[PDB]
Every structure is written in C-alpha cells, then in structure tokens.
Amino acid sequence: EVSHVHKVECVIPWLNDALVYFTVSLQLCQQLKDKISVFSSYWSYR
Amino acid sequence: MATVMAATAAERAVLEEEFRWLLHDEVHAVLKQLQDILKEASLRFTLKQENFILDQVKGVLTLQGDALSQADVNLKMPRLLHFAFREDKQWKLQQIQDARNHVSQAIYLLTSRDQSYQFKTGAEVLKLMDAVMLQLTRARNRLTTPATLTLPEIAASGLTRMFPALPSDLLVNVYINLNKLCLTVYQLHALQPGAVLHSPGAMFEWGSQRLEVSHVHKVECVIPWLNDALVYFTVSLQLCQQLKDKISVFSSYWS
Amino acid sequence: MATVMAATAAERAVLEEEFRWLLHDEVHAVLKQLQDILKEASLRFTLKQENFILDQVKGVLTLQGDALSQADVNLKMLLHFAFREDKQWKLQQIQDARNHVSQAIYLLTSRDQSYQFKTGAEVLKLMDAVMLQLTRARNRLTTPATLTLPEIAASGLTRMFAPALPSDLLVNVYINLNKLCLTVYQLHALQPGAVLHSPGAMFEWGSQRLEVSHVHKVECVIPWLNDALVYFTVSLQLCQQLKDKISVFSSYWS
Amino acid sequence: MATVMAATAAERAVLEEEFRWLLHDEVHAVLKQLQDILKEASLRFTLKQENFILDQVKGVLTLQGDALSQADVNLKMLLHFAFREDKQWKLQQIQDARNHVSQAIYLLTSRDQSYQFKTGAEVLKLMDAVMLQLTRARNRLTTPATLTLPEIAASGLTRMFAPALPSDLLVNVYINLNKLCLTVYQLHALQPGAVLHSPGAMFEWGSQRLEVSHVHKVECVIPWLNDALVYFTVSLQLCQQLKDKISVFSSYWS
Amino acid sequence: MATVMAATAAERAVLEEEFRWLLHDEVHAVLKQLQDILKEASLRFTLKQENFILDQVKGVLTLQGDALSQADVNLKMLLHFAFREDKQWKLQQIQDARNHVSQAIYLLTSRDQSYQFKTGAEVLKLMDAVMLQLTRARNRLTTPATLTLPEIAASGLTRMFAPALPSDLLVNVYINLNKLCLTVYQLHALQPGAVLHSPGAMFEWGSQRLEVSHVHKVECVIPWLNDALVYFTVSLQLCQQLKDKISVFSSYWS
Amino acid sequence: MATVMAATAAERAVLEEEFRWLLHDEVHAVLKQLQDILKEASLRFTLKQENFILDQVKGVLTLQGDALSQADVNLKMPRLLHFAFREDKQWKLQQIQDARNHVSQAIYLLTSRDQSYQFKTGAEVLKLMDAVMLQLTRARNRLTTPATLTLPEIAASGLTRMFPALPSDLLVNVYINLNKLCLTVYQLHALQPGAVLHSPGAMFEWGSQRLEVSHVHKVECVIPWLNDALVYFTVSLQLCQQLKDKISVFSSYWS
Amino acid sequence: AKQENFILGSCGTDQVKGVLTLQGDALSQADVNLKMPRNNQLLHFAFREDKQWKLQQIQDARNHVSQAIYLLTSRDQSYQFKTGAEVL
C-alpha cells in the first residue's frame, strides 16, 4: 500500500522551446488553411 | 419522492442518448453518400463526348474537359464564311474551371473530417452543411450564364484573337449555360459621328471606335456530362437540406 | 418506456412547483419586514432629543428634524455667537437621506403582493433598487469630502450668526454618518486647491486670498440618526439574504 | 514581401507563447500557495486556547471548535449561571465559515494542475468562486445584524442555563469577526421593530409585550479566529493579484 | 394634425439639446477640477517633512520622496543601527502610487476639451479609468498582506544596516495607507505558512527553519501622504458624482 | 415650455395609436383571408376528377385523394404488355399525404389563435407568418419531384410488388411533380462480370445482382385539384409576405 | 549552450531532492536525496554505471517532428500546387 507520495519537478527549457515551436507551427498551419479556404471558396487556386 | 424523480430522469436521459446515436448514424450515412455523389460529379469534369454540333449559324466544337480545344464556325450571311482556331490553340472556358474548383472544395470539406466522433448538438454539422451547400450552389451559379459580361469584355477576350483571323464587324463568344454549350456571334455596325444589353441596338466603345450591335446569332447544344453534374448538385443539395431539417427537428424536440 | 418518463416529469415538476411556493412566501415575508423597518427609519426623520452639546471650542445646537433651529457657540481665541430671529439652517444631508428612505418605501408599497412567483429577476431588480436607495441615504449621511472652503464661505450659515461675525472665521455644521458636527475654520489672508480642510490650506474668497491657520472640530452623537443607520444596515442585509437565496434557488433548478 | 511577414508572424507568436508559459507557471504557483494557506485556515477550525474570560458583567466560556461547551456567567443587577449536564451550544457562524473554507479548498484541490494554459477566463472564474467563498466566510464571522430579540428568545441558548433562568433576562452569545461576544439583555414587560438591540427597544414574545431596559456587552479576542481571518485577507489579495495580472496579460496581447 | 406634432418634436428636441449643453459644461468643470486636485496630489510625491520619529523600540527615519535615505534604530532586547554609506532604500508602495497618479493625470490631460457632448458612455469610461488608478494608488499605499517573512528576509533592507546585523533579527519598513511603519521581527531557529506575521509563526530561510518569537511595531504619520490620500478620496467622490449625474440625465431623456 | 411639449407628445401618441389600430384590423383581415384560402386548399385534398390518362407508353390511373387506387399500364415494346394492380390493392402517394399534413398544420396555426387581442409590435405576427409560410413552402416542395430517390429505393418500393406480377428487367415508379401525376418505367439490363442519375446508362445494385438502366419512359398528366392547391399556396405566400412587409414598414416608420 | 543538469525540489519545502542529468531523450543521471522516514534521517541513491534511461515521450515527439519535417522537405519547393485542396 502507498503510504506517501512525493512529487518534485523542474522546467526543461529546451523542451519548453520545442512545445512553443509546435504550437506556433500549428498556428501558422491553421492561418494558412483559413486563407486558402477563404480564397478557394470563391476563386480557383489556379 | 426523490428516488422516483432520479430513476425517472435516468429514463429520459437514456431515451435521448439512444436517439442521439440514431442521429449520429444518420448524419454519417448522409455524409458518406454525399462523398460518393460528389466524387462522381468530380469525375465528370476530368477525363464521354467531346465533339458537339450547334438556327441559321452552325458550329462544330471540340471540348476536352474545361478546354475548348477547337471551334469550327460557319456563318450564313446575306451573300457563308468558315472559321477555325490556330489549329494549335485551346480556349479555356472559365465557368467549368470555377465549378470544378467548388466541387473540389466541397469534397475536401467532406473528406477532411473524422468520421469517427461521438454525436453532439448539430450546429457543427449545420455549419458543415452550409459550407458544402454554398460550394454546390456556387458551382451551379457559375455554370449558369454570366449576365455581367460586357461586349467590350467579350472583345478584349482572347477568343477573338483565336481565329482565319477576322474583322471588327464580328465578335464571337463561347460560354456555358447550365447544361448547354453556347456559341454567340455578334454582328456589329460602326456609328456615324451601357454595353450590357447584349440585344440588337446596343451600343458600346471598343479600341478607340464607337460600335453598335446590329444582329445577334445564338446557337446551343446540351453537354451530357454537365447535365449529369448538375443533377448531382441538385441531389446533393437536397440531401444536405434534409439532414439540416432532421437535425433541427431533433434539437427542437429535446429542448 | 414513456409512461415511466411522464410520471417522472410530473414528480420533478411537482417538487419544483412546491419549492417556488416556498420561495414566494419567503420573498413577501422579507418584503413586509422591510416595509416595517424602513417605515420606522422614516419615522425617525419626521416630527426624541433636540438639544445637543458638542475641548477648546464648545457649542449648544437645537436640531429639529432637518432644521438646525439654533446654534449657540463659544470660542476660545472667549467670544459667543447665536442665531438671529428664530431662523433655522437646514442640513441638506438629512433631507436627502429622508428622500432616499421615502423612495425605498415607495418601491416596497407600490408593488403587488399577489405576485404568484415567477422567476426572481424581477425581485432581484426590486432588491437592487431598494438597496441603492438605502446605500445612498447612508452615503449622504456620511461627511461630504467634496465641500470646498469657498463653498463653506458661500453657504448661508456664515451669514446666519448673531452678532454678525468677522472675516477671520468660518463656521460649518454638517452630519457625519450619525453625529452632529461643528467645525470652526480660523483664517487670515496672506500678503501679496481649497480641498484639504487642514491647517495650511489656501484658497480664494471674494476678491482676497486666504489661508486656514487652524481648525477646531467638535461633534456629538445623534441617537435617532444612529437608530436610522442601524435600520439601514439591517435592511441591506435582509435584501442581500433574499437576493442570495433567490440565486441559490434559480441555480439549483436550472 | 511574404517571407519577411511569415518570419514575422513566427517571432511574434513565439514571444506570446513563451509569455503564456510564464503566466501558466505563475497561476499554479499562486494556486498551490492558496491551498497551503487555506488548509491552514481550515486546521484552525478543527480539533489552541479553549477557555476565555469576557465591566459590570463578566463571564468564563469554554469554546471547543464551533461548540460552546460551557458558559459560566456573573451578573451584577450578584447572580451566577452555568450550563446543565455537559451540553454544548453550537455557534453556527463558525460552522458556516468552516463550510465556506471547505468549499474553497475543494475548488482548489479538485482541479487539474496539468492546465496547459489557455486564455484565463477559466482561471478568472475559479478565482471568483474561491473569493466568494472566502468573503462569505468572513462575512458570516461578522456580527449578524438581522437577528431579532424574539429570535434570540426562541434560541436554545436561553433554555440552556443552570439554574433555570428568569423572564427578565435574555442571553445571547455570538461571534463578531474574531472575538467571542456575550450579551445580556435586561427586559421588563410594559403595561397595557425588535431590530434595534438598543435600550428602549420594544418587541413581543410568547403572548406578552416586552421592552429592553438595558444591554450589557462583553467580548474577548479568539486567537485562532484572528489567524483564520488574516489567512482569508491574504488569500483574497493573492487571488486579486492573479486576476489583475491575467487581465493585464490578456489586454496586452489582444 | 401634423403641424402641431412638428412643433412639438421641435420644442422637446430644443429642451433636450440645451440640457446636453448644461451637462457638457458640468463634465468639463469636474474634469478640470480633477486635474487640479490630482496635480497637487502629484506634487506631494516629488521633491515638507523628511525626518520622522517612530514603546519598546524607537527609530529615526529620513524619508525623501520614495527613498528611505536613512534609518537609525534603537532596540531594547540597548542595541543601535544605521545605514551604510549614504544609500537609500526605496519604498516601492510610494513609487507605485506615484505611477497610478501619473496615469490618472495623463488620462485627464490627454483628452480633447472641445468635446461637444455626445452621450456619456465615453465620459463614464474615462471616469472608470481614472477611478481605477486612484483606488489602486490608495490600495498600494495600504499595508500589503501578502508579504511573507522569507520575502522580508530576501529584501535588500536586511542587508542595508550598519553595523552588519544578526540572524535573530529581521527588519521591515513599509507604508500603511499614510504612516511610515517600522517592524522588527525577533526570531530563533527551532530544534530538529510564513504568512501570519504574528508571534509563533514559522517559516524557512536559507537552509534553516526559524520561528518568530515576538514582533515589535512602531509607526508615524506622514503628513503629505495624508494630504495625498485626502486628495484621492475627494477625487473619487467627484468622479462618482459625475457618473451619477450622467446616469440620471441619460435615464431621464431615454 | 413644458405644456407645449406635453400636449404635443400627446398628439403624436394619438396618431401612432390610431395607426396601430389600423394595422390591427389589417392583420386580422389578412389572417381571416388566409384561413379561407387555406381551408379551400385543404378541401381539395379530401373528397373532382379521379381517372387520368397519361409519348410511347400509356396509362390509365385511378387516384382517390392520396391513394392511387388503380394503375393500368401499357408498354409498347419492339415486339405490347398490359399491367394492373391486384385489383384489391391501393398504392399511397406519400407526397400528397405530406402536403396535406403541412396544410393541416398551417390551418391549425391560423385557427388556434385569439382573433381578439390588442395590437402589438408585430414580431409575434412575424413569427406566425414565418411558421405558416414555412408550412406552405414545405407542402409545395414535397409536391415537387423528389430528386433524392434512388433506383434501389424505387425497387424496394411496394409499387413493384403491386402488379400481372412482373420481371426484374422492369421497374415502375409513380410520383407527383407539382401539378402533374407522373408515371415512369425503367427498362433495365443486367451487366457482365451512384444510382442517383435516373438517366439511361445509370448503374446500381439490387437484391444480390448488379443492374444498369437501359431505357427510361416518362409520361405525365395534369391533376386539376393539385393545380388549384398550388395556386392557393402561391397566393397565401404572397398575402403573408405582404403583411410582413407592411408590418416592417410600420415598425420602422414609428421607431 | 544547452542545459543538461536539472534541480528538482528544495531542501526545506520537500522531502525529496534530485539532480537529474537529461541528455536528449536519455536520463543519463538521477542523483537523489530522500529525507525519509523521520525528519532527521536521509537516504541517498544515484544511477549505476554509464546507463541511459530513455524517456519515451521525448523519442516519440522527436520522431513526429522528423516526420513533419520530412513532409515539408520531401517536396520540390519549386512545386506549384494544383488545387487548394492539396495544400489543405
């Protein structure tokens, strides 16, 4: 049986950087998708 | 008594949930059917007949997909003249390209969704339906005769350049009208010392000269695969509308 | 099965209904209590002590309702002052407070006590209105900060004393929450804003520039003002309690 | 040029992202601190002094948690009173306060500390909930104004004294923010409302009409109540600070 | 009849127009007054007394603006302390308050006084902004509750005394609304949170665990802080009055 | 001066009130007219002609209300075959039932209101109008040719079972198109080792076999009472729209 | 420079403290002090030989990153797209 639980933690700066990069990239992708959909809904991409 | 009310509330909650699953299955069924129909509609725009014969002015046009690959025209005057393209050249009909784009977008809207999520209110389905229907109605609308094409725009069109090379008493326009490939010849008349009418007696300026439409000759021919495509659009629109209506009935029923 | 479910909507709906009747009775109980308390608060303002004695300045003021009917003041600088004729200086704070009380009571008595309880937002609006009136009355009773020394000078009170008084003295009488306050400002013009009310404050008056050299403040508790304030506090709490219960109810069944 | 602009959306988006991680860490830091402080505040209410001595009336009260286990009172009118058996009178204010604390702590411990910060409106809602619980606890600890003399009479406390006591006396024990309060109301029925709690207040009880002739009030500071209140104040300020920082952030990047 | 009705829209519209010009003049009057008062409040923070004397601990502090330039302290435990060099400890509360004042004044002076009165919601927004700045200044001046003993220890002030001082003493200097406050915490580490600031409070510092054994608090009124606070209160009331009049107007003609 | 402004304000208040009564009377007038027209439209769906003769394929159909009581069909092949129902059986046309339901609902919307209340803003009238118009437009839409009927749905329809009993090289469909009773015969062709087109060359699966439509024969005949009903729908829709527009003009006029 | 040693926990607030050396996805060291079971005792543990503890989360994430980059780089960046749907 678990009697006690001890949890310690630390920010990992480069992991944090990675997450930030993932999020920002996701945002770039969605913005591009939105522009493409907006344009394409009326005009042809080519 | 609280036990009655709780067991009870569980009974209504169960019925509503089961109905939510029914509606889930209905939604995805209709969506799948939409992808099938719309992909067939898509297949109609790319390669079926290619040569078409179009009154008192006659024409043989070879149309491959969206490209009017050739256009051979005979005009019977009070006198007959005969025209053709540069042999090497193709005139693209923008309406078909546009329509094909809208179809492509609709199909993307249908295939870029996870067909595996649990059912919700429906407002999201409603938005999907609106998007798809907008694309379909736009495709159909583009296929229809554009009213806002001026005679100077027709003159400035590449099609005039595309013919033996011919005078400035004649303008030639080829367009699509729903389910019909259309050839129109405008016979003109320079005037002695707007542009929207397209009827005999319409006036406009071109180049640096002022011109009047003297006569208009209109011939047309049904394009079978365009007709199939339009039929597909209509059916898809109705399927979408039916799904929207059922979702509304459901949502109002349990609220 | 649909019969189970119909029985079920019925029993839930019955419980909720009965609870709305409970809340109905509670609302009107509280409202009636509010009218009682507020009418007593009202009775404090109309007509109980009238003479009041207010350590280097002392004064005897006769206050009748909102009217300061007499003010006999002794100042050690001993010089002595009184009112002329039988004239009364009205303390506007009391008038204003009485007005807010009157309005609250109107809000309570001009309503249909055959309410057949609806939702509660209407009750909530009523509660807000009444509470606004009460809090405003109490706020007015409190010492007004935004009174300038030139406004004090331009007040009729300065004109009001017998013998006719000097331009090195200003007299102000006001109410601070629940105690009659008498303040004497001793000035003297300087050789060749107005908000601080403290020694060393400067301001203009008439066509001359003056500085407050010191300030004398005496005060005395007014029992019926205290009663009124207690009534305001209790009424506010009753209102708040009703609002909170209504919110709990409405969130409970929604 | 589009490449410049893409680089540009990238750098702005990176800065904003990093700042959201900062705000993420700040939020959880504050939340953890709130749980610590509030759990200590909670520990003050459960089980530290138990015997308390409360100038013309004096009393010795033994208070265990929310239960007034004994109350031995001497009154100069000298007469002497005590509890019967080993019975305890519960002070509901403490119970209520403890409930609000319990709720706040639940609000803090029943949340996912793997938040991956979103916007802040959710944090803001949490902050509002907790602050409401704290402010309510503190408000309850404060002297309730809306307690009528007949409610005091109908309270079990009157029944609770040994020897069995007279109908010219009422006894009330309550908590005012942080100090145990004992009040004795001396009455006497008149010959052929209820809210003021002051000498000269009139009310009905049983089938007889009574008037408060005078009131005796003694009080004593309760150290752990004071600790709890200090905790409430500090927690409220921490919450407010977090709300304000979130608002600054959200307005800054919007 | 339409002529009657046209005349009629004309007369109503004229009355409402004239009243908007009245409200226009009132708004700008109040605004100008606010700039005057707030600029004086501002003048209190920049440069008037500088030396202050703050019953078992006593101290002489020289405070210049926001900078505590010197602090000579005597403690009975008699031991004596002072600053090193000619260094100044800045009291951040004063800096913050001065910032809020600066912002309020900007809000007032960066606006077009050729307003041609519109509706009032814009005025209301301005009033809200200014009032927020004032209330924040005042709140900051008040004693911060959320300061932990380890934060006090980590403060530069502990490092700041000559002779270099012991680890059984902590010194904190802060401002509480309007009076310079000096507090000495007497500690002693125990044998093998931090928020209460009272005797018997426990916390960690460095790598050791410490408990506050007792606390000594002395304070002294700062006259110009008091003036500033009075200014804040008056400004807040002026703002509130303007808001209320605007609301009455807008509800009156709607 | 306040007396001027008050008497004055009373003058405008009086004019606006009187106009509100005018609009009240107009609203109820239009509503009554709607009940009359719609009840006549309703009466058209229940009992007028019952026998109908419907190109190169011919038919005599007996239609009673919503029930196709009999359908006698001659098909002229390259060779003629003759078909009839079980004599005893009736095929119900769902479009008519649906339309009749919408009409019933519209009439309920009109008759279940107190024709005696004082006039208000109109938003309530606007909602009533929207409801009624939705019912009418739905009735009309249902009467129209349903596009979303697949060939396998036609095969799975009871109508096929209803005929002497006939092969699986023939499918028979009877439906309504606005103002025309329609009979369509699909001539099929099993294929050697979607379904939406309804045109020659369309493919689909049925039973456990794969089939292709080889030819399509379409005949139709006007149904007089359906035409009357449709005319009624159109007129009612216009009456509703006119009332909506007038109410909007009023409400914008006095705001 | 990129950080390799990380401090988890404090001496006073926690009963566990650790200095973990994390290299890429690999936990190369975990040097841990535990103040258990009593508040004056302390036990000590640390990695054994030159071992790598793989944090699977980091490896997986890195794989997905690689795949995304592949999707972007497995294209002729002089490739004109045909429809908008292809880009989507």
Numbering used by the authors:
A (entry chain A): 240 to 285
B (entry chain D), F (entry chain D): 1 to 47, 57 to 63, 69 to 93, 97 to 180, 182 to 211, 222 to 283
C (entry chain C), D (entry chain C), E (entry chain C): 1 to 47, 57 to 63, 69 to 91, 97 to 211, 222 to 283
G (entry chain A): 56 to 143
Give passages from the manuscript:
Rogdi is the human homolog of Drosophila melanogaster rogdi, and is a predicted leucine zipper protein of unknown function. The human Rogdi protein comprises 287 residues, and is highly conserved among species including fish, fly, frog, worm, and mouse. The crystal structure shows that Rogdi resembles a boomerang with an elongated curved structure comprising two distinct α and β domains. The α domain consists of four helices (H1 to H3, and H6) that form a left-handed four-helix bundle through van der Waals interactions.
Native crystals of the full-length protein grew in space group R3 and diffracted to 2.8 Å resolution using a synchrotron radiation source. Crystals of full-length Rogdi contain four molecules in the asymmetric unit. Interestingly, there are two conformations among the four molecules, with structural differences mainly at the N-terminus (residues 1–14), presumably due to crystal packing. Residues 1–14 in the two molecules fold into an α-helix (designated as RogdiH), extending the α-helix to residue 45, while the same regions in the remaining two molecules are unfolded and form a long loop (designated as RogdiL), suggesting that this region might be flexible in solution. The three loop regions (residues 64–68, 92–96, and 212–221) are disordered in the two RogdiH molecules; however, the electron density for RogdiL is relatively well ordered throughout the protein chain. The structure of the two RogdiH molecules and the two RogdiL molecules are almost identical, with RMSD values of 0.4 and 0.2 Å for all Cα atoms. Given that the N-terminal residues 1–11 are easily accessible and prone to proteolytic degradation, the non-paired region of H1 in the four-helix bundle (residues 1–14) might be flexible in solution. This is consistent with the structure of RogdiL, in which H1 helix residues 1–14 are disassociated from the helix and form a sharp bend due to steric hindrance by neighboring molecules in the crystal. The extended H1 helix in RogdiH engages in a parallel coiled-coil interaction with the adjacent H1 and H6 helices from the other molecule via crystal packing. In particular, a highly conserved hydrophobic patch comprising Leu 23, Ile 37, Leu 267, and Val 277 from H1 and H6 is exposed to the surface, suggesting that the hydrophobic surface generated by helices H1 and H6 could provide a platform for a protein–protein interaction module by conformational changes of the N-terminus into an extended H1 helix. The structures of full-length and truncated Rogdi are almost identical, with a root mean square deviation (RMSD) of 0.8 Å for all Cα atoms.
